[PDB]
Design a protein around this nucleic acid. Sequence first.
RNA 1: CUAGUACCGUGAGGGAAAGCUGAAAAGCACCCCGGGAGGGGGGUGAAAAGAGCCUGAAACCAGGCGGCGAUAGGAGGGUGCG
RNA 2: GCCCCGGCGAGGCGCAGGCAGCCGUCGAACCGGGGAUGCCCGAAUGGGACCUCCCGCGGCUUGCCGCACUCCCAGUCGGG
Lengths: 120, 50, 60, 154, 102, 51, 62
Amino acid sequence: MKLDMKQPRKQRKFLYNAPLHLRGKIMSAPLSKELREKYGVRNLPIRVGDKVKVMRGDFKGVEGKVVEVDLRRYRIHVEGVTHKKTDGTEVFYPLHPSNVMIVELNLEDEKREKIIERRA
Amino acid sequence: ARNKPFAKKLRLAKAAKQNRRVPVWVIVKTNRKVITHPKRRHWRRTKLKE
Amino acid sequence: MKPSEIREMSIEEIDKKIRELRLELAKERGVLTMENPMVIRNLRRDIARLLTIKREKLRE
Amino acid sequence: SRGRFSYSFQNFDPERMARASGRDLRISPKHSVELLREIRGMMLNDALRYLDDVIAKKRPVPMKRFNDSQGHKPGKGFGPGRYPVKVAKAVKKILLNAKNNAEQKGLDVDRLKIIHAAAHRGPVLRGYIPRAFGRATPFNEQTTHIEIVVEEIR
Amino acid sequence: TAQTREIFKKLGVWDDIERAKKNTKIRAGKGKMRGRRYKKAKGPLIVVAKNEGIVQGARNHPGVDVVTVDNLGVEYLAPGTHPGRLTIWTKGAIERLREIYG
Amino acid sequence: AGKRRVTENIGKGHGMARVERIKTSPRFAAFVPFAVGGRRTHPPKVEKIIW
Amino acid sequence: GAGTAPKGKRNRTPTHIRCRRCGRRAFNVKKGYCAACGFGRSRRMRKYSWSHKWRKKRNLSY
RNA sequence: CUAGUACCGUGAGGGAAAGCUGAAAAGCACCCCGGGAGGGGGGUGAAAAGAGCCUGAAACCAGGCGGCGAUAGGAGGGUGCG
RNA sequence: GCCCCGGCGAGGCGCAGGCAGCCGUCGAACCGGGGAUGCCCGAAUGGGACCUCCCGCGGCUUGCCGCACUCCCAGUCGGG
Ligand SMILES: [Zn+2]
């Protein structure tokens, strides 16, 4: 996307009001060195059925599958990243994808294959 | 009995439908940020324009 | 209930389907006063589809 | 649970003391002040007797700070006096709350003693009364907070 | 840029470039809302006769300015009204000075 | 800016100062440079020469 | 006198009702024209330069 | 910020106020009292920051602590001491 | 909110942190472009408006088209 404006008000306005077909791109994450060597790609937009490793925060070092992606709030849900409630129900802790790394992809649609073919 | 023009009757019906409070699920969904709207009106305090 | 199917049909069938759908809508709105709260929405949009495509045909 | 106010009392020992509060009450803070000045430093049961008597209008409460146009009463030591019934009732409710809290903490009611009793002014509820010559003047309610601390004499 | 890096290491101005990098701060005040954050320090100034790539090569070094002789001003030579800036000259630039004298 | 309100002054003999005031419900002072929401006495101007 | 008591004789027919073109209650019912838009008196809109009403309605500077 | 909005005037017209929990709702499980607003115990959180929510000044009110205090005369202070 | 051509590539159902449920891999939501539907008043125009609502005349086949004022070209058809 085209972003050439040195005014923070305009940058943050774009970010807060960006249309949906760009939030997936804004929600990208990097690959592990193995996948990087294999496919020739440094980062990809994230998807639900992906295997994921946490690199920053309290749950540093945990691995899990992605189960939910919210484009409005710019967040994702990971299995195993949870806290308990006053009563005792478990609930997910919402994470940013810039704080996480991909270790196994979900390759069942042809369009992701095309994204890789494109940026490699 | 009491004689009304029809368009006037319809405008009055609209003004009556307008006069109720914000529902409860809107308050739940907004986290107590929307509680009122500016068209509450009591028949004996603020008059319509007929 | 999609244009794929709708455009395979003739006009009389389309009008008949519109008719039955409108009666369904009236009955469902009647019961709604006293599950699946999207029946009304989907019925409305099906009616819209049918009218759009029938007009495409009768115009060409 | 879910309390949003603190106390003016310092050095609270959870082992020998219990607390109680009343918040946002539609009563007179002046009369609250006058009344609490009397039960300060007393035993809980003696204070409950005092309040019963006040309510039944057999014991008057002296007025030493808020006494404009107030008549005297029969008995030694009385200039201005009064009978605040609403305030008595509310204070009685709070005192029973405190007695319960001590009983459940594990103290002994026979030796409970009031060591802190203070009234505070709460938030005002604005109102208006129509006057003559096209005016409208305030007609407001002043609310009251009351705090109480009980200790066990050993 | 890497060749410029090596040349500056051999000449002895890489340490002033490092000072420029290190002495760069986030401002105090409301200029941060209006952009204008990151008050940046000044490094060396390269005066050249003709540009044939050195502008691109040296641009991205923090504090480094590149200018030709025909387009010199006093803000390149005395930032903040304080004169005595570290300057790298060229032979052609000095000959053009011999010609124009200013 | 500051010169959008319509005002009327009360004058001598109201136990009040001679300030220009709005003529509906609140009746707040307006348009003067010591009033809240009024015009500024000596604002910056683009005519000014900086060169 | 002239104050509170004459205010009781405001139960007659109103001087203005709603206008079909403008929307507001300024249509003079006995003369047959609107005092805000000119309906019944002119095809064109009432629009004076000394007025602030239309500028306010469009959020314009004076 | 649900602003030319609410509201005022028969009308021409006049015209407000109102921003901020927390990294994450983890937005308070369970117990005693109370007709109930709610209070007291217990819990979440790095921190109650508790939705009457960032920080939280002064005026003003109450309580506690210290000094004085019912034979006594000046715009409430100044100098010197106890 | 309905349809079609392209883009993007899995989620989506406005401000708006809820419940119950639906749409989408036959490529959605979203974005660029092009179409359909588009109640009443209003220049308001078949005729009337003290209440954004009422009352008609022709022609065709219950549904459709025409029917204001001031003019031009014409001419008892029409086109502007
Ligand atoms: Zn009008």
